[PDB]
Amino acid sequence: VPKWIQLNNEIMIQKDGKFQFDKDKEAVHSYFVDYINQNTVFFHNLKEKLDYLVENQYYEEEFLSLYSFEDIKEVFKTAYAKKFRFPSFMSAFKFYNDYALKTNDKKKILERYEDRISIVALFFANGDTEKAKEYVNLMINQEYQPSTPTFLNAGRKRRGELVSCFLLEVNDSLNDISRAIDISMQLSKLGGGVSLNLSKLRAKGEAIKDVENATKGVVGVMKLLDNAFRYADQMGQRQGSGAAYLNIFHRDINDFLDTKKISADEDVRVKTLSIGVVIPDKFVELAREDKAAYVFYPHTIYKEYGQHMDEMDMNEMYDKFVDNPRVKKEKINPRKLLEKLAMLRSESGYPYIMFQDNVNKVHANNHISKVKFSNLCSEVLQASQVSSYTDYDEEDEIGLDISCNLGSLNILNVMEHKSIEKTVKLATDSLTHVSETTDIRNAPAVRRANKAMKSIGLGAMNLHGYLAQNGIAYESPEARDFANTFFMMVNFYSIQRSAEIAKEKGETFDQYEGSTYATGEYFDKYVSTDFSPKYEKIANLFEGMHIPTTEDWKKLKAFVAEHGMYHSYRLCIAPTGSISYVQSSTASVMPIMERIEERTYGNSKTYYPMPGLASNNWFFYKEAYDMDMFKVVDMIATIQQHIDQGISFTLFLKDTMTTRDLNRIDLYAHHRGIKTIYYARTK
Amino acid sequence: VPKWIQLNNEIMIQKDGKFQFDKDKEAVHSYFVDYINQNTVFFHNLKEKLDYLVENQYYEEEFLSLYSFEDIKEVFKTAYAKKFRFPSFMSAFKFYNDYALKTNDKKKILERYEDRISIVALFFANGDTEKAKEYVNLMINQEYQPSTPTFLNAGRKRRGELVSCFLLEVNDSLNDISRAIDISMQLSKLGGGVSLNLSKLRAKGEAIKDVENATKGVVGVMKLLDNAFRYADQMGQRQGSGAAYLNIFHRDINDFLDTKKISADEDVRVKTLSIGVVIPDKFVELAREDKAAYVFYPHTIYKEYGQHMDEMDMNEMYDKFVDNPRVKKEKINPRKLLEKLAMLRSESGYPYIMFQDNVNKVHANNHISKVKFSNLCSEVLQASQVSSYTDYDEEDEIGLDISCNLGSLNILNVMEHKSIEKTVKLATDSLTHVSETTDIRNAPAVRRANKAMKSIGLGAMNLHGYLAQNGIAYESPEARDFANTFFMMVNFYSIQRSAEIAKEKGETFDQYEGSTYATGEYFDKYVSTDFSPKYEKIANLFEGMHIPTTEDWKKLKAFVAEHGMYHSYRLCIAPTGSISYVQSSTASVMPIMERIEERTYGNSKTYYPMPGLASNNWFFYKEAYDMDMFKVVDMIATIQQHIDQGISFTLFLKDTMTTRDLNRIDLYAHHRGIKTIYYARTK
Amino acid sequence: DFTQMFYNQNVKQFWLPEEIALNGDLLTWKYLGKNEQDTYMKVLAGLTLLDTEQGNTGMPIVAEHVDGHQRKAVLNFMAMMENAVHAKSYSNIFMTLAPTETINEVFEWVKQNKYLQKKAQMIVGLYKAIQKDDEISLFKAMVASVYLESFLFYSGFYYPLYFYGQGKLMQSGEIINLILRDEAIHGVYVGLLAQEIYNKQTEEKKAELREFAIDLLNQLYENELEYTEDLYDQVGLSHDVKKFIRYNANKALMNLGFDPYFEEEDINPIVLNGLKATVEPLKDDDFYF
Amino acid sequence: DFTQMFYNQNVKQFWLPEEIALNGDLLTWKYLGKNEQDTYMKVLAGLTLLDTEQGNTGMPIVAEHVDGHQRKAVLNFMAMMENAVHAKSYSNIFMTLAPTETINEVFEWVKQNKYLQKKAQMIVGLYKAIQKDDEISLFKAMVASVYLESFLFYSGFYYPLYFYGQGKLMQSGEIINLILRDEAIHGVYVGLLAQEIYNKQTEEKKAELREFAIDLLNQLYENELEYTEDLYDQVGLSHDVKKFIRYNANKALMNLGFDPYFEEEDINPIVLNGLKATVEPLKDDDFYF
């Protein structure tokens, strides 16, 4: 048993009726002094280390050649000038086991935390020494954390893509289905999660060019995609993860849901394919009034109207579809479908729930397209256009497939540094750089949408950690007040930075002129409502920091009208799974699942108290399962009103909660404006 | 009970110790006058019939527009002047259930046998009235039978392709694997059977861009292809049929064979994918000497030598691969592998066995490529060049993927009419037309190889029927003498027709000048050895029909050298499954399995005596299971020496014989020059 | 001289209740009077109890004390049939025909029924009195087992057979006939083992063993009469069933090598109507021709 | 929570020796060396002898002390498989491969063998020590039973699986694979019954039962290493057999709800080739807030 593992295990040994939280500092100190400093390759000078890394196929010479070695040396000086110390053993362990650069035999350590941060900053700045130093200060202060792909792979020769979330539209054709399988395998090969919209595919028992009842439906494509993701398993390193989305009004919705039942047949069940259900307001209205609903065969609708069923507004088109004799449908019970959804989420956590009209009532790019589905993590909500992949000899009609770049603000570190504006703008610049430097050669729609939309996702994390370390309960109205003010400021400065980038480059995103940013409809609630804190305690948290006012929002609206907006999408709160340990932060804006995290690595068990947990703030670190999910919905809806994309919203349920309770949580989320629901986690 | 199937069941009622074979004539007469004439749509004149069929999307207007209606009327008169009568109930039942045109609701019958034959003939002739009449005479006399795709779809609007056998080479890349899956689904959608070579794919545990043990092997691609063929099943009426081929020296050969074991897990076993094993003479030599053989990792060989393993000569490079330290190899026992092959064929009928050096020692187009795999029916043996499907933005290097049009001579009717030459030439013309009118716009390599190679497959059937109806035992030397003379004559006239077509069109097949036809080496055994029958009984069977001598073959060799050949491949003997009933013929050149064949169609049981079966030739219709497989191998090898492609050779095994007997049959087939072994059928 | 043939017969008779679909009895069951359904449920419940104890206790304990691996294999197989096949089949019948409350009630009824408790007390008492290496205590338990197999089941078997013979409840009846076919061979086999022990005794000891067997039979018989009346009076069949159990008592005695004790009587004729390829290695000479 | 599920899996795995024809094994048996034939015979006799103890004592003694009708039925079924199916199967394999005199000599040798006897008597000792109404002694016997089913058999199973994975002795290898598949489920089932007892204990008593299980495992494991070298050194396989023993020891521990004792190891590839919370309806007013 390692000495640091023993020291970390002494946290649970209760001395004087309290956990020994101070043992984790001893644990991390022992971990470093006994393992990391021993296994860290040291070089006489930074020049020798850099030469070894570039020449041994560890780094990329292209981005490092943009600086004189003096500038790189000063950047590394800035990283090491902070004397950053990992507060807990788990932070250092996670970094040096997941993100630190190791030798080709994975025996020694080439990169410390400072080296990784310096390389990421030098890649972000793209030749600017002052910008690189600013990125170094931002990341070594741990105010901004680039996503796991960006943080892990930036500046590495043998790297995967810096983007890991992709959203593909699948057209109703064998050519398009085969192309979707190919692109899914190509993107999973790069290490990215792939989400596929299956709503355009015609249901089971539909006609294929005069041969009726010949289509296997969305479940055959589901099996194809599941095997494609199983094959493209990231070189046998990490299991290939993909998601499939289907509209709740699709005829195959029940077959779609039956793929996740525990009793599912092996010719129906899918293993590596997550499922998400898209629910328009029409379905919730039908279930509310207990009227019997209809699911429609998409190809009949396409033949009758020339438009896909998911391309049309179900609120206005549902009655026309039902009254159309040439549109094929079967009766369903919407309440029974809702209960089936809740039962499936209780049993397996699936499907994801995307409230279509909650997303699109505040969507800023409805002119480009409505948001029809989400990503594998249920936070990316962007307009997509389906591609028409024709025969081999013909020319394909390339659409827009969603792929956004992820980054997370550390709410605790941004708040303690009083640097919401600077951190938000620098994170926007880094995400923009990642977007520009991303070129995917086997997903033409993804590449086209990356070049045109220039969408980024700037998330946040350590919300519960910041609140509990400041004596604020997560469910308290003061917590929602802080979330309101903080994310209003984040949105303000992200919009300002996007407009500044548009002014600097003289270009906006494609089809910006039709957006609500161009017409000013986006800024209505910001030029009409004041989002300053309503509590003196919360207003004191923002001391020394200018909270944007209504006049500031009017000035921003005028600036955006004059100069445009560079990013179609800017903010999305991803789960931030493994980077939260490195940042000593609670995951995303979700509340903590456990106060102290018990995990086993190898044959030794490890203990991870939540960051900042102590005796004084023990009960402010309320576990998510002990919380009222209605108040968590209230918090996420408070945040969601300032996030243009969605938020990964996990439901934390007790074992005593019934199907009716899960349905009530889902319906209250729909009522409160929640866009997506990620997971149903039961204790 | 239907009257016709009641009459057909009176065959088995033994009267005076004999089967009532004449009941089948009464059975078919009742079948017609009680079902067919009643359910047949009859029009006032042929003009109304043709207008009705063209207008209601049953026929194609383009091919019928090349003839004035007087010519079409003359063709239909020629078809009906024969007054063809089906000799058995099964012939008419199979035709009117599988190939006769029916109304859109599958209610009534639009085409008789004469109508279908006339339409196929007018399609073949392509505007020529006299040629259409010649084709009508050829098919109404049942001397030549177009394959099931051609006979079923010739001249129909809503039709599949006229070719159903496709062979695909898969390169060792994810782009090429995705393209292989796409092309397999596209061709299965067209109704064709697709065979894929998986030898170029690197084995399990190979590196994918310097990360080791990353490749899932050929079994992952096998699962992908199996699900692709399950998806593209054409309503499931005829589910997607695929074949995978692996060289026996591939490292994944044991896992490739384990996909067919009964005890295989659901994560390994493939169900819709047939498997074939390509065995070079090196493997048979290694097993014969009981030496230690080695299977190789294909990617190591490709990296070391720059060529794929299956693109190299194993009999000359096996020792170099073994001695090469940079080539990765695994030790196997070749005799244990042979025993495993025999056990797998006994328990499942798989794999197909291709003797690669038996195919390539007589292959005429080794300059283009060596034959590396066979088709799903294990009789197409043509040169293929792998394609290089690149990224979306890059141009693809299109290779040569095999596909040939099938057609069978009826040996009994051809020999009765003394029309080997005319039947062979007309069948060659029809197959050439089918090749010219085929355009696969989603399989680039299939299209390119169809345009370049112009390969056709002209098979034969009713060999056992003809021999049994002429008092010749299938195993007798006289039967092999007849097969030798008959198929030498077929080869002579097919080569003559190919040379005449090349002379008329002024073009040969691509890379003809490097072929053995151009060098004249192909004709060595024909200008040196006389193939006239050695028995007076057989010599009288060919009386009235000129048998080409050595002088005739020398003249043909000069003609080919001076004019070239239009088809790279001309003759392949396919199984000819369902068209054998319509033609009242035994299936292919293989011996019959049952003298009287009992089948259940729906809830009706009906019996099919072999064509011409009686008491005077009961024992000449010896079942395939009761005869020596060594003599059947001798017969197939006698036929194979005149066939440029392979012969679908089914092994008929008793329950008593062990795996050693199956291995002995396989080794004797390899010794006797058998190119492929199709099935190990056990009774 | 006999174990091997009993082994073969027992294993070739192997079956599971799930082989018989029971939904076909649903209508003929629905059509019976409340009295008939009550008697039927109770009859099968009494059978379930007997098989429960024969499987849990009787057959395993006799297996323990009988010498010889083959004899033990037969007895172990018979034990498995009792509780894993026979006792369970009754629950398959109950679960098809009856609602849960009626099922719960009938199992409560077995616990409190004095005749069923008495017969279980007597039979199981003898099983648990077996002493290691004491052949006399073993003989007594084998007599008890034969009386359970060949006599005691029959007050229960009568009714399913009575219906089967009229073309009623024929799927349940098929199960019961399979159970009866098994018990007949079980009674013969255990009877032969009992005779082995009896034949080792002095004439004086034999006389005492016959007294034991006849006294036990009479005691069980008198209890079975009261049980039979209690169940069958409400369906009018008690006298008929009594004739049937006497008939089968004689068969039990015969299985033990004793003379019949009751006089022959006419049984209801309805009830009588109720009755891979081989792997061979390749040789070197196989590669040359 | 589990007995009916195991009942189903057990009865659907039912098989008989006669189903596999054994004679075709003579075509590969004749080609093995003397050491290979000797090891095979000795391993086979080892398995036979241990399985007889399980059929005559291990399963019936556990069935006797476990409460519950359904558990007793499953346990009876397992005892039946040992005595009626497995024992006959081992005998059949022997009679096919060796003449009568050779069989008698191998059994004489293995009966006197120190390492086979040590483990056989250790297991039997724990079965003999079970006391009526004492769940601690029952648990200890269940641990012994799981160790036999899921661990001790595997030093023996190795060899038939090794041949089976190479295409040798395929008929007897198929039989062994069916036997092994039964022992696997037996081990899992008895393991669940042991965990039930374990979970009823105090924390101090649990720690004491864990120490018992680990101590017993250690004694058996050290003897297995000696047993292994004694049989497999002559055919050069002992290193790989030892990996297989540890891997199966870990499975046995997991069956008892305990952590693995040994580090994970890869196994010989030839041997490998041989081998609802509560639904509640929405009652309106849940759509309004």
Ligand SMILES: Cc1cn([C@H]2C[C@H](O)[C@@H](COP(=O)(O)OP(=O)(O)OP(=O)(O)O)O2)c(=O)[nH]c1=O
């Ligand atoms: C991407 C991928 C490839 N493979 C296998 C299948 C292909 O035959 C083989 C080649 O993959 P490639 O697509 O050629 O990968 P690569 O070009 O980046 O690697 P290399 O430089 O070695 O050519 O790898 C997998 O098994 N799983 C996978 O996820």
Ligand SMILES: Nc1nc2c(ncn2[C@H]2C[C@H](O)[C@@H](COP(=O)(O)OP(=O)(O)O)O2)c(=O)[nH]1
């Ligand atoms: N010497 C050295 N410095 C390293 C290494 N990895 C990162 N660094 C950082 C530490 C300093 O901030 C910076 C410059 O180190 P140096 O080259 O030793 O500089 P100097 O102090 O000699 O001027 O590089 C490393 O491996 N060696």
Ligand SMILES: Nc1nc2c(ncn2[C@H]2C[C@H](O)[C@@H](COP(=O)(O)OP(=O)(O)O)O2)c(=O)[nH]1
């Ligand atoms: N009348 C008619 N003829 C058919 C039909 N299908 C095929 N035929 C064939 C039969 C004859 O050989 C040929 C000409 O038939 P027709 O048009 O009736 O001509 P004719 O009998 O007046 O010369 O067409 C059909 O449906 N009707």
Ligand SMILES: [Mg+2]
């Ligand atoms: Mg289409």
Ligand SMILES: [Mg+2]
């Ligand atoms: Mg490649």
Ligand SMILES: [Mn+2]
């Ligand atoms: Mn019974």
Ligand SMILES: [Mn+2]
């Ligand atoms: Mn019994």
Ligand SMILES: [Mn+2]
């Ligand atoms: Mn056993």
Ligand SMILES: [Mn+2]
């Ligand atoms: Mn067992």
